[PDB]
PDB file of C-alpha atoms and ligand atoms in Angstrom:
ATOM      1  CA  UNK A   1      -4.192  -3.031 -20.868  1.00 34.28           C
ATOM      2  CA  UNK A   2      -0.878  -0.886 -20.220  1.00 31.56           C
ATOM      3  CA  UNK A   3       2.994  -1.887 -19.711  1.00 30.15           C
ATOM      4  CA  UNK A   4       2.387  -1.171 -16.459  1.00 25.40           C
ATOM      5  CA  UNK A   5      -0.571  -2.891 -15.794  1.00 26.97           C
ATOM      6  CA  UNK A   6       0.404  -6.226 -17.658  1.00 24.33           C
ATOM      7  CA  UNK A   7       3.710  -6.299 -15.293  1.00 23.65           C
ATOM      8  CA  UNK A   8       1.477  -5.990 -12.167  1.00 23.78           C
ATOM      9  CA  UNK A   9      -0.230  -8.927 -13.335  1.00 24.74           C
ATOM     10  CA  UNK A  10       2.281 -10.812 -15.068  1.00 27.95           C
ATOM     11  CA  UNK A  11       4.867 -10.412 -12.030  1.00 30.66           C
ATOM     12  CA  UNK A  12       4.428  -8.283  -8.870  1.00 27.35           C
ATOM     13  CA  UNK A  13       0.413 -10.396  -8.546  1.00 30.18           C
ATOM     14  CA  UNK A  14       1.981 -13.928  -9.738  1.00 29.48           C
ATOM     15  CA  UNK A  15       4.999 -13.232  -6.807  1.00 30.84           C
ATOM     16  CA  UNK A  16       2.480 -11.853  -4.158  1.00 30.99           C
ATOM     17  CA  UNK A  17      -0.483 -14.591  -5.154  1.00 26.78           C
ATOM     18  CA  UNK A  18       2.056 -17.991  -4.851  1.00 24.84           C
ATOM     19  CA  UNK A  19       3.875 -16.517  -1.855  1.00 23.89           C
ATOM     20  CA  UNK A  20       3.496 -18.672   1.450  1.00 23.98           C
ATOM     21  CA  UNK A  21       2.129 -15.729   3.560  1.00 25.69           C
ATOM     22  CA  UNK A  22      -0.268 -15.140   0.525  1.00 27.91           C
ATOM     23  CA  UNK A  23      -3.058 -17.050   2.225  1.00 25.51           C
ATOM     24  CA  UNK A  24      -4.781 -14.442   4.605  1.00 28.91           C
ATOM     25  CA  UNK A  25      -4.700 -11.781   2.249  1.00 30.21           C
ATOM     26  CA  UNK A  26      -6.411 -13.833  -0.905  1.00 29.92           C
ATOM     27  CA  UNK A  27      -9.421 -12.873   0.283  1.00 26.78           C
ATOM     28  CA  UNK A  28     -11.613 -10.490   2.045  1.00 29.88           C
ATOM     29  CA  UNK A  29     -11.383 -10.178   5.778  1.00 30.49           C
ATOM     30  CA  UNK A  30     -14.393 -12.448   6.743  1.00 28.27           C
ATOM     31  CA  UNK A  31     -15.247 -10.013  10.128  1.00 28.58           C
ATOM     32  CA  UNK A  32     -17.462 -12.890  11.283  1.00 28.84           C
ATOM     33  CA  UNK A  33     -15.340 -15.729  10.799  1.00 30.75           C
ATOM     34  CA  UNK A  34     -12.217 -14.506  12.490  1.00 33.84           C
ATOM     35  CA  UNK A  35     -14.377 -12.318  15.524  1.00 29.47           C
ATOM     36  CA  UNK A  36     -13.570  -9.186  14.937  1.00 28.17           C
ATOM     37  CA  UNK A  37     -16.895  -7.381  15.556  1.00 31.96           C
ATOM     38  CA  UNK A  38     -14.561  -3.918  15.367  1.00 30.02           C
ATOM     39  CA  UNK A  39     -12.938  -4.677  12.180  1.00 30.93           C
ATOM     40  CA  UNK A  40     -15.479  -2.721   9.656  1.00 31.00           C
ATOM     41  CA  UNK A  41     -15.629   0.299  12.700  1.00 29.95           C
ATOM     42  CA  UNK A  42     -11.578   0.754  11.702  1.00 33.20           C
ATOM     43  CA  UNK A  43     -11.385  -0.547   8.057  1.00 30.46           C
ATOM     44  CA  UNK A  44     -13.492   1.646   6.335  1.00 28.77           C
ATOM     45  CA  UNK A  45     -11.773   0.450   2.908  1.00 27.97           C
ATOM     46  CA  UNK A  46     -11.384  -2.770   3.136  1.00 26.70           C
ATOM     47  CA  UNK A  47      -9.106  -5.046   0.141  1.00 25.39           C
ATOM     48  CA  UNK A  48      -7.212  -8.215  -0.603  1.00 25.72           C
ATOM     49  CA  UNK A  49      -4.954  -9.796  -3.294  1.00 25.99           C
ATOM     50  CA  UNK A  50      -8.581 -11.974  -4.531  1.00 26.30           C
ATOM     51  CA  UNK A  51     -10.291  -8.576  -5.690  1.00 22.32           C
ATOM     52  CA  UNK A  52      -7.005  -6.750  -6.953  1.00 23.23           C
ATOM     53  CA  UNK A  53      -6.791 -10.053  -9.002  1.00 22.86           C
ATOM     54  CA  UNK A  54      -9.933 -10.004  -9.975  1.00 20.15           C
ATOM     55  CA  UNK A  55      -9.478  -5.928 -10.898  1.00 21.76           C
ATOM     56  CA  UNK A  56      -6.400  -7.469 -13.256  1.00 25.41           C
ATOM     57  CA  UNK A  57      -8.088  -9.818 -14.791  1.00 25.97           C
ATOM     58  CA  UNK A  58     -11.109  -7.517 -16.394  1.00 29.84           C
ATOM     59  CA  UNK A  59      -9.254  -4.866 -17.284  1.00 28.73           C
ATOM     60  CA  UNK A  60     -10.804  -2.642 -14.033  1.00 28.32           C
ATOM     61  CA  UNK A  61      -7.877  -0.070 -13.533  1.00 29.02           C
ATOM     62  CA  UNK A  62      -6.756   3.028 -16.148  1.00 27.85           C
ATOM     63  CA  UNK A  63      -3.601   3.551 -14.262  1.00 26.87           C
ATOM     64  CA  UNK A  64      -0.756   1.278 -13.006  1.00 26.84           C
ATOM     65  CA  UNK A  65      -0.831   3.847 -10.159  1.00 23.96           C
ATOM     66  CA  UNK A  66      -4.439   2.484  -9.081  1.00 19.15           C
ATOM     67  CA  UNK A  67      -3.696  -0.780  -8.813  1.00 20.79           C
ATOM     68  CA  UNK A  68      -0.332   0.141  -6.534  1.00 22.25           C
ATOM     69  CA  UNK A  69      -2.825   2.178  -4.223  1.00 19.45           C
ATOM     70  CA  UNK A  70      -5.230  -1.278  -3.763  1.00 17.97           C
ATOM     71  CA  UNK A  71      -2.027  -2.991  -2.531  1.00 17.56           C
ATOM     72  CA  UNK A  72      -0.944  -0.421  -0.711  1.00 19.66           C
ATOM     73  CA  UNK A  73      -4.330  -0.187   1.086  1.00 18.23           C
ATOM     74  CA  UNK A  74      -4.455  -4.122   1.814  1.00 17.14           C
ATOM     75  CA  UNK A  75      -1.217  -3.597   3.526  1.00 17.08           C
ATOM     76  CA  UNK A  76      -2.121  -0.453   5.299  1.00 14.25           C
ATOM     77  CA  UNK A  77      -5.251  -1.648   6.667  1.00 13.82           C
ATOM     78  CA  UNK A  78      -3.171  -4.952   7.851  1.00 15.25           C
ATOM     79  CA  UNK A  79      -1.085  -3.017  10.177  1.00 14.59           C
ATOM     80  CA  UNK A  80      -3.615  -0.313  11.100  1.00 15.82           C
ATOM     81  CA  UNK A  81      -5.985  -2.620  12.681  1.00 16.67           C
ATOM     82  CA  UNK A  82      -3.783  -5.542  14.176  1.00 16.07           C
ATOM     83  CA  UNK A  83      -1.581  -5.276  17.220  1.00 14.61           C
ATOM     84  CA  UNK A  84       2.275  -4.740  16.269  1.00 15.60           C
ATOM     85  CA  UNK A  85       2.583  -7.887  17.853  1.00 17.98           C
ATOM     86  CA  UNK A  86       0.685 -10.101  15.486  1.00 20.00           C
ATOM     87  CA  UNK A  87       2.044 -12.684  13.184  1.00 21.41           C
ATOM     88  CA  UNK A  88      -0.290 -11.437  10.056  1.00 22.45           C
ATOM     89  CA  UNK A  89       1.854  -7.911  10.888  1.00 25.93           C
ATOM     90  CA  UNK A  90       4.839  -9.544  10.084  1.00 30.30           C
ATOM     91  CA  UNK A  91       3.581 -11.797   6.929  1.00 30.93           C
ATOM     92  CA  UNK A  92       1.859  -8.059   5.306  1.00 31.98           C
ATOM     93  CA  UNK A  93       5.423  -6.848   5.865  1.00 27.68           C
ATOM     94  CA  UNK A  94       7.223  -9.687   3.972  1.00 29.78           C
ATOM     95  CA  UNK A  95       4.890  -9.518   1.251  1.00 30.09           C
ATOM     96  CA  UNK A  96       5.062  -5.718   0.966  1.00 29.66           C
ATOM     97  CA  UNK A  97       8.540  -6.035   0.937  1.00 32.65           C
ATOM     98  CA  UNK A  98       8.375  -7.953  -2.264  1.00 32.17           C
ATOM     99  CA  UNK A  99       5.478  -6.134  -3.510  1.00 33.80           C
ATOM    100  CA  UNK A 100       8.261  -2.846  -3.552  1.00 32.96           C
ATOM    101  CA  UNK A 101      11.499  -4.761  -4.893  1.00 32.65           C
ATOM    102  CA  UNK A 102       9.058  -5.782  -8.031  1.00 31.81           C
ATOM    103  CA  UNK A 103       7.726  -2.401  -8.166  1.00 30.22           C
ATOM    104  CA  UNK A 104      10.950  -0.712  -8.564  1.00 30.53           C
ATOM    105  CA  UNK A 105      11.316  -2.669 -11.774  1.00 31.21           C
ATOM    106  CA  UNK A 106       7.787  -1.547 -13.346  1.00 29.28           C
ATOM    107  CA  UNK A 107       8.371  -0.135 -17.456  1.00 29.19           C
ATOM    108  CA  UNK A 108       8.167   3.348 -16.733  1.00 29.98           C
ATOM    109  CA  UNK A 109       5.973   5.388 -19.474  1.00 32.58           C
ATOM    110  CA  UNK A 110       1.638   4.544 -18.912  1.00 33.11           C
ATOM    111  CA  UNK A 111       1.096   3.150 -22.429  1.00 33.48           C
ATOM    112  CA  UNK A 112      -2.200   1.522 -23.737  1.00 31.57           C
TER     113      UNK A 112
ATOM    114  CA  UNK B   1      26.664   2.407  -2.646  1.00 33.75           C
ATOM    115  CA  UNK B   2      26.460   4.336  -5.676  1.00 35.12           C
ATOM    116  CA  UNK B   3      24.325   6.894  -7.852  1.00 33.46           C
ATOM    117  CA  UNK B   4      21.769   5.542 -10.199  1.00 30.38           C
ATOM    118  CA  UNK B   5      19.413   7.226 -12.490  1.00 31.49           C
ATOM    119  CA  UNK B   6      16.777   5.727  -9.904  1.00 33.11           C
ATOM    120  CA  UNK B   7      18.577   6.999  -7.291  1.00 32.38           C
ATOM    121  CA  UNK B   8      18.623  10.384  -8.253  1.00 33.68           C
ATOM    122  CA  UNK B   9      14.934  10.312  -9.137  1.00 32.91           C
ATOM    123  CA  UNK B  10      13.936   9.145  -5.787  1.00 34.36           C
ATOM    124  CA  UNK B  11      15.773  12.068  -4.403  1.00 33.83           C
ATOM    125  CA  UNK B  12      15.292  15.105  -6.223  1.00 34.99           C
ATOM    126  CA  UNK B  13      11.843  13.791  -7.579  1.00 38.56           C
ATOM    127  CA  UNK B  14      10.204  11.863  -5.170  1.00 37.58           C
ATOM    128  CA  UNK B  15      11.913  12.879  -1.703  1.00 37.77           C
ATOM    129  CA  UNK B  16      11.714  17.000  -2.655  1.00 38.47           C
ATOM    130  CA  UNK B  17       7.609  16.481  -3.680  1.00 37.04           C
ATOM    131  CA  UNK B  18       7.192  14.443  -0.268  1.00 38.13           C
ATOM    132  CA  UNK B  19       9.739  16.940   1.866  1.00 42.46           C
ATOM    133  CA  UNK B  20       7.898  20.193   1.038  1.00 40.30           C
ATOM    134  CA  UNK B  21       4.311  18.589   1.616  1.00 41.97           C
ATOM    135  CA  UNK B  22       2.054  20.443   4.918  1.00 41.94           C
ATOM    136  CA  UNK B  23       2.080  17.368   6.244  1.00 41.95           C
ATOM    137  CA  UNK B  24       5.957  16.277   5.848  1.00 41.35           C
ATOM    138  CA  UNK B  25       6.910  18.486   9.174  1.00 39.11           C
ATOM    139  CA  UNK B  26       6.440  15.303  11.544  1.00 42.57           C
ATOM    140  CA  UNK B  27       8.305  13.008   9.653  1.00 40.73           C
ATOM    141  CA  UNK B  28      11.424  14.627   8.246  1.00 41.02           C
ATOM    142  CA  UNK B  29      13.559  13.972  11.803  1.00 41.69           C
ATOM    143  CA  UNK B  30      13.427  10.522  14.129  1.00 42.50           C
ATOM    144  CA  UNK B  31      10.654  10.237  16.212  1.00 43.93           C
ATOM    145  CA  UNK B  32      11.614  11.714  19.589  1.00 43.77           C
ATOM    146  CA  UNK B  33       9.995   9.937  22.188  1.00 46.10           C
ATOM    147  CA  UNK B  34      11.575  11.401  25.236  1.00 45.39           C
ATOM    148  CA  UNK B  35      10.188  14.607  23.820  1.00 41.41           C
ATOM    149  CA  UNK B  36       6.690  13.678  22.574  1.00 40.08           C
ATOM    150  CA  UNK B  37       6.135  11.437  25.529  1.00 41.53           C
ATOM    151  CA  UNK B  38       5.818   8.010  24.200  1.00 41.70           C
ATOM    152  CA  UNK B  39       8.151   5.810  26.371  1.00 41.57           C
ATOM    153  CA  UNK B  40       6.893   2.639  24.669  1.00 41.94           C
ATOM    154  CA  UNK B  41       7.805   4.059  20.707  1.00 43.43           C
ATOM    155  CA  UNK B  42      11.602   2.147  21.174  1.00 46.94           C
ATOM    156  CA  UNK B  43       9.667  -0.960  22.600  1.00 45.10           C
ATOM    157  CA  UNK B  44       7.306  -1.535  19.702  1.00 44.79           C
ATOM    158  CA  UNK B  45       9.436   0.466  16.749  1.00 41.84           C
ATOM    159  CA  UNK B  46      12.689  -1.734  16.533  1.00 43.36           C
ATOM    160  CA  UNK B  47      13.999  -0.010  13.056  1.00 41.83           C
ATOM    161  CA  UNK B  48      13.242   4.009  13.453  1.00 44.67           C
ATOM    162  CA  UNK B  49      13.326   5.547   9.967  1.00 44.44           C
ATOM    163  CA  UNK B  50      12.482   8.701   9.120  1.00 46.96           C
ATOM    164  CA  UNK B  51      12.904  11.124   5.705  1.00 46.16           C
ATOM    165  CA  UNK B  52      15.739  13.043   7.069  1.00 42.33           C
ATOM    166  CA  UNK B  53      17.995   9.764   7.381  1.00 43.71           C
ATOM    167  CA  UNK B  54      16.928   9.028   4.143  1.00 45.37           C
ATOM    168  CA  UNK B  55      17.669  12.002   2.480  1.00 43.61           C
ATOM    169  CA  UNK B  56      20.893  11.693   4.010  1.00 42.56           C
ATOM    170  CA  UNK B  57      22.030   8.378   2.758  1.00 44.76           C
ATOM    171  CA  UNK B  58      20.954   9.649  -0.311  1.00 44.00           C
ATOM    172  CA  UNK B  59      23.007  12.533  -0.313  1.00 47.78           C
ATOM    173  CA  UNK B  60      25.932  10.442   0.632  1.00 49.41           C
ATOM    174  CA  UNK B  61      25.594   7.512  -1.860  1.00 44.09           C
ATOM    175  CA  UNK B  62      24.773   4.974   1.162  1.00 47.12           C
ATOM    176  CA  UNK B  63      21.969   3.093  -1.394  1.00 44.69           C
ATOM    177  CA  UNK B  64      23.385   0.453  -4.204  1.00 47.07           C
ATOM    178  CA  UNK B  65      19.876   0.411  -5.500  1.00 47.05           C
ATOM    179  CA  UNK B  66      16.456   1.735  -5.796  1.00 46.03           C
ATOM    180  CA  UNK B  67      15.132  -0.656  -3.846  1.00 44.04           C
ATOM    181  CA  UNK B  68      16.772  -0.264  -0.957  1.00 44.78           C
ATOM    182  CA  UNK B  69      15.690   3.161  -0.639  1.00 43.62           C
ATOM    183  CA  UNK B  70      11.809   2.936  -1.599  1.00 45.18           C
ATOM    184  CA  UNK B  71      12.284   0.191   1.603  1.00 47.22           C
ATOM    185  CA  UNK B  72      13.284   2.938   3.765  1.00 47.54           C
ATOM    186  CA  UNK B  73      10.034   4.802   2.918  1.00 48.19           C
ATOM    187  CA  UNK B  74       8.378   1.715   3.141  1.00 48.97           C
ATOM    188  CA  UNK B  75       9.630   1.231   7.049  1.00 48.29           C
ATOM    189  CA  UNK B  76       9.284   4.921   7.799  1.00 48.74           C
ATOM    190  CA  UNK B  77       5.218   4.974   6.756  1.00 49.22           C
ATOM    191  CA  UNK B  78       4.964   1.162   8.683  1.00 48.38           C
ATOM    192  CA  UNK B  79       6.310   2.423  11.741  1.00 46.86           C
ATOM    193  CA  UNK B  80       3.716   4.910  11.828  1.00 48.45           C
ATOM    194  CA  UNK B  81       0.868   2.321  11.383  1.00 52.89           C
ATOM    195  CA  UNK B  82       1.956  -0.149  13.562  1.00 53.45           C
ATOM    196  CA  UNK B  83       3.193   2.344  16.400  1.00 50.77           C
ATOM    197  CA  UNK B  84       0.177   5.090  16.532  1.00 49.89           C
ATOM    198  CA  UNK B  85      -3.916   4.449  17.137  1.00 47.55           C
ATOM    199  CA  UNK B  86      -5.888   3.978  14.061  1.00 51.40           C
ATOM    200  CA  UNK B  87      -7.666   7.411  15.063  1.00 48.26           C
ATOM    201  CA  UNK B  88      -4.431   9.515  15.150  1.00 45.04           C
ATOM    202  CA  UNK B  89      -4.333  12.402  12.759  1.00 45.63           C
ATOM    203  CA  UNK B  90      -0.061  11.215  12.421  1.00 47.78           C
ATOM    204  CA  UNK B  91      -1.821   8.110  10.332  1.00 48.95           C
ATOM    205  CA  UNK B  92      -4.012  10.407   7.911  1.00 48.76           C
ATOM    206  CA  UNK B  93      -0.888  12.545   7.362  1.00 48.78           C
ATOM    207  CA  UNK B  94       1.241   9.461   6.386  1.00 48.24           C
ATOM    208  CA  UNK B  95      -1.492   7.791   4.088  1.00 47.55           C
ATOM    209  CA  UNK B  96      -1.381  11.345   2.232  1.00 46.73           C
ATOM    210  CA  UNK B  97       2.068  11.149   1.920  1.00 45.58           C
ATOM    211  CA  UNK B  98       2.681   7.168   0.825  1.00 46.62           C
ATOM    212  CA  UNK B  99      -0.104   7.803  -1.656  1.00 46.35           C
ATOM    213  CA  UNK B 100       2.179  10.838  -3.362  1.00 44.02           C
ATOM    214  CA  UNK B 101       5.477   8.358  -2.624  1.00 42.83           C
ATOM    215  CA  UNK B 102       3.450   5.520  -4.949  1.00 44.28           C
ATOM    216  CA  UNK B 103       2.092   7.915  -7.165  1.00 43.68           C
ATOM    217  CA  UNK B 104       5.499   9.190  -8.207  1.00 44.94           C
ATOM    218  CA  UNK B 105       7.797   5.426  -8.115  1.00 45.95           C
ATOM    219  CA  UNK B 106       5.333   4.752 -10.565  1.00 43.28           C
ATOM    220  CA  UNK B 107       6.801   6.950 -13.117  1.00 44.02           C
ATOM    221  CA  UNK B 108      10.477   6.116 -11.856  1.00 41.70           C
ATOM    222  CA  UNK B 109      13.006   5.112 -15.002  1.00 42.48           C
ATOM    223  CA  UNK B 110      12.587   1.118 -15.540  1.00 40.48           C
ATOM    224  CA  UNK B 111      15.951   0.982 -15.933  1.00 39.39           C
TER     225      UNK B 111
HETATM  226  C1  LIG C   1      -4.928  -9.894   6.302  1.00 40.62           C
HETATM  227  C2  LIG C   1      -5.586  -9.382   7.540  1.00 40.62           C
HETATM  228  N1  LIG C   1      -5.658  -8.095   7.744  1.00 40.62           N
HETATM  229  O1  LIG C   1      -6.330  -7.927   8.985  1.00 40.62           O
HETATM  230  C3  LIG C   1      -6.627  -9.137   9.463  1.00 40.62           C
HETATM  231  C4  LIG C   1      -7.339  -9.176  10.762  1.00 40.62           C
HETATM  232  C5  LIG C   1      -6.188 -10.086   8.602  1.00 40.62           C
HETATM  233  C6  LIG C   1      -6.322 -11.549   8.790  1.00 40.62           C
HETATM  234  C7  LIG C   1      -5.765 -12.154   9.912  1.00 40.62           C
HETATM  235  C8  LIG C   1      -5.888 -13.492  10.120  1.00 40.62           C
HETATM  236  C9  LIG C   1      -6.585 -14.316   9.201  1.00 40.62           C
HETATM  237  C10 LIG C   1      -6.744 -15.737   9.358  1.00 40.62           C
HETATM  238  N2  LIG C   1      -6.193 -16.397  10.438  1.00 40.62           N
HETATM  239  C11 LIG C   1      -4.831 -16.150  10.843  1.00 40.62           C
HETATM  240  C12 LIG C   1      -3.855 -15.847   9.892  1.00 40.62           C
HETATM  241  C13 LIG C   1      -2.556 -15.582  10.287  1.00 40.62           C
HETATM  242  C14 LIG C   1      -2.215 -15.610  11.620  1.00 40.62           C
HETATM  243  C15 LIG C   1      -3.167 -15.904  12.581  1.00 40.62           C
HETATM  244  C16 LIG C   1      -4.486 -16.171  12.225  1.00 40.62           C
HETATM  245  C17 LIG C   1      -5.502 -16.489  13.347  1.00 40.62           C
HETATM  246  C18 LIG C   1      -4.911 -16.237  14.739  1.00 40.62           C
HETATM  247  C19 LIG C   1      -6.752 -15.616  13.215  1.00 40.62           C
HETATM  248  C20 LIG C   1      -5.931 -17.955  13.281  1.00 40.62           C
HETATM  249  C21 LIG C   1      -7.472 -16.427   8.356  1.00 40.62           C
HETATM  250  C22 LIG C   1      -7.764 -17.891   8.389  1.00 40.62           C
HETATM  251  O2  LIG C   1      -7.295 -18.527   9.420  1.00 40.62           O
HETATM  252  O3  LIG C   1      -8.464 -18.424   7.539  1.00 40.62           O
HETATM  253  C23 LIG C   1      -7.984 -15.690   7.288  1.00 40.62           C
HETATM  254  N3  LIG C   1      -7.849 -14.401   7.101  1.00 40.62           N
HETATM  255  C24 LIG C   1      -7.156 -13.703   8.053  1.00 40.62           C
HETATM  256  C25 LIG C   1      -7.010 -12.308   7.872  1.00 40.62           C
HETATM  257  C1  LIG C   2       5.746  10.351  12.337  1.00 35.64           C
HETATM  258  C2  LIG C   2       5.419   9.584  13.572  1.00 35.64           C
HETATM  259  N1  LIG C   2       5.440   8.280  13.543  1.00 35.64           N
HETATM  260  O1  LIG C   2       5.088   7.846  14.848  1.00 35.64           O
HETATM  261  C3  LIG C   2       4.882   8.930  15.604  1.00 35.64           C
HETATM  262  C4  LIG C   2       4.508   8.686  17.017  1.00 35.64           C
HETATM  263  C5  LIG C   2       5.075  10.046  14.860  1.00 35.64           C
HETATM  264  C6  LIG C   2       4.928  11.446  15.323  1.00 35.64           C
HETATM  265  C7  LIG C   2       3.707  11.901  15.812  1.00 35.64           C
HETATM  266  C8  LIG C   2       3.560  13.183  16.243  1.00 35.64           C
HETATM  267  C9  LIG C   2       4.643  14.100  16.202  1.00 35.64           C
HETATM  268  C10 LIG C   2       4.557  15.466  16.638  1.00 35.64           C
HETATM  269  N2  LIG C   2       3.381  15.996  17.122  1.00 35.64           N
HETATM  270  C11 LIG C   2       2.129  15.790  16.447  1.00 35.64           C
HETATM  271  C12 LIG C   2       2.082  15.660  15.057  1.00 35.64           C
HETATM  272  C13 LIG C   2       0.875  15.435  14.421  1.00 35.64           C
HETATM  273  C14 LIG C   2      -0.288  15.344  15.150  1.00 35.64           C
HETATM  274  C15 LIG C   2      -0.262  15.468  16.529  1.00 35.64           C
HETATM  275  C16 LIG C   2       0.934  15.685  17.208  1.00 35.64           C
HETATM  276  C17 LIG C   2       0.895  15.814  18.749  1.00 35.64           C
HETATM  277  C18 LIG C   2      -0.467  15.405  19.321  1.00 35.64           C
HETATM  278  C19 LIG C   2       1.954  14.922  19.401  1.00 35.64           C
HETATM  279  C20 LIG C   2       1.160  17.260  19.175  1.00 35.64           C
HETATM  280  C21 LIG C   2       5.728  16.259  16.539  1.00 35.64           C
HETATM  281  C22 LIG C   2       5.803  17.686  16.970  1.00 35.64           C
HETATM  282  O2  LIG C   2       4.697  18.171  17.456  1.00 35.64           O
HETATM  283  O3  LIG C   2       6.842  18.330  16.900  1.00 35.64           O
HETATM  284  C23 LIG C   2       6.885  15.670  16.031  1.00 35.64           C
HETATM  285  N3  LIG C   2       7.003  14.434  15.616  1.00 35.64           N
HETATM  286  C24 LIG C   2       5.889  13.638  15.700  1.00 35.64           C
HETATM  287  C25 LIG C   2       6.003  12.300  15.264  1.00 35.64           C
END
């Protein structure tokens, strides 16, 4: 349990988790639910804020780094599959937006 | 804006790994979509960014903060997403390269 990884959970996870746009993204992309018979084709890595959180909370990742790249892939994958047009486009971007303002205050050293 | 300690770590740190990288070539100018071909890229793409513009307002103080820089980056590897076909080698090359850009904030000063 680094810094790093305590202010990941402690703040950039407790912003991203509460946030109103938060909803699609706190768990898995249910392929079958939403009729996207494609989505697992284009994803081949799929993630969301429920497993990261999950990650947090039993001490999963080594590096603070690790955790960043789970985000980062959530977000990715958002804008990868989905039309530039669509409204979960927009709500990955306003997360990921505050995901990077909280990330630029991170401690700095990877300390256990 | 002004120079931070931040500031000057995202640009001779972060922005001079990311510049030199094989696959920096197609992002260190605008997208130019009279030349490539893509008459749609201004259409979909409403806030073009790119590494050289960033460098730039780094090199002339344009950023007050951190922040407002790794958002740059941010919009710059989005664009690409959103813009390009999932299948495009452009989208490989810019996962390699956000990956190093995360990699390296992560051991920016806390300040
Ligand atoms: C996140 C994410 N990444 O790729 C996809 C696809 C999603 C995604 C998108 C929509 C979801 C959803 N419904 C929803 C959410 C926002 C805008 C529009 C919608 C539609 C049009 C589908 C109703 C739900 C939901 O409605 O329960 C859950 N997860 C989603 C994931
Ligand atoms: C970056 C970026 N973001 O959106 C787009 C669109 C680009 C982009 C894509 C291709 C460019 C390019 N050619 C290139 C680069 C990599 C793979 C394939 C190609 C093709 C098929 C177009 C030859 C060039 C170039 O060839 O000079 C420049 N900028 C690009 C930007």
């Amino acid at each position: 349990v680094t810094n790093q990884l305590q202010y990941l959970h402690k703040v950039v996870m407790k912003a991203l988790w509460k946030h109103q746009f938060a909803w699609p993204f706190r768990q898995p992309v249910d392929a079958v639910k939403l009729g996207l018979p494609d989505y697992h084709k284009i994803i081949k890595q799929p993630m969301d804020m429920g497993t990261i959180k999950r990650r947090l909370e039993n001490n999963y990742y080594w590096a603070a780094s690790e955790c960043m790249q789970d985000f980062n892939t959530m977000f990715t994958n958002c804008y990868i599959y989905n039309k530039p047009t669509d409204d979960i486009v927009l709500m990955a971007q306003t997360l990921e937006k505050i995901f990077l303002q909280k990330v630029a205050s991170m401690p700095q050293e990877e300390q256990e």
